[PDB]
Amino acid sequence: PLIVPYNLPLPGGVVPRMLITILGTVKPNANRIALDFQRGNDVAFHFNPRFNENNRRVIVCNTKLDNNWGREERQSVFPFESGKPFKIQVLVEPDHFKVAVNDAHLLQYNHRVKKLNEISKLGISGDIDLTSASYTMI
Ligand SMILES: COC(=O)[C@@H]1O[C@H](CO)[C@H](O)[C@H](O)[C@@H]1S[C@@H]1O[C@H](CO)[C@H](O)[C@H](O)[C@H]1O
Numbered sequence: 001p002l003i004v005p006y007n008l009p010l011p012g013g014v015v016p017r018m019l020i021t022i023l024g025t026v027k028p029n030a031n032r033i034a035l036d037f038q039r040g041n042d043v044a045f046h047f048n049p050r051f052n053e054n055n056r057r058v059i060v061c062n063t064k065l066d067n068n069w070g071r072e073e074r075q076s077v078f079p080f081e082s083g084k085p086f087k088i089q090v091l092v093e094p095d096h097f098k099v100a101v102n103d104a105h106l107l108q109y110n111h112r113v114k115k116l117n118e119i120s121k122l123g124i125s126g127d128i129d130l131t132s133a134s135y136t137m138i
């Protein structure tokens with residue numbers, strides 16, 4: 001597999017029609033997973049499944065600018081399960097990142113960072129065994 005945390009370079013940043021696919025398996029007794037689509041030190045799109053926040057499972061998404069986190073967007077639909085294989089697809093669309101897990105739509109996150117072509121790295125971290133991470137233009 002791959003070593004987590006893993007860095008996937010996104011040459012020339014992201015663009016509408018670019019699809020990022022992450023395959024892996026959640027560790028037993030997981031606490032968190034995180035995708036960090038980075039513009040330099042800023043995080044344009046942070047996707048953070050939390051497996052135990054006050055005994056609830058929640059996906060937290062946010063942007064970090066100049067080292068400050070913004071206002072979080074939260075989703076109680078939670079398709080992940082400890083110990084199980086998953087696929088995350090992030091499709092960049094004109095106004096938002098669209099995320100599907102295991103072929104089912106999960107959430108959309110509107111672009112806050114506007115310089116999409118400078119979002120040049122995806123960091124993948126957390127309690128997972130990472131099998132593959134790649135992109136294709138669709
Ligand atoms: C570091 O604290 C925070 O920014 C917030 O802290 C509160 C608790 O007071 C709560 O945990 C919020 O979820 C965040 S935690 C923070 O959240 C960002 C995304 O908003 C990232 O996941 C980061 O890794 C977390 O530490």
Ligand SMILES: [Cl-]
Nearest residue numbers: 058074075076
């Ligand atoms: Cl919620």
Ligand SMILES: [Cl-]
Nearest residue numbers: 112113114115
């Ligand atoms: Cl910007």
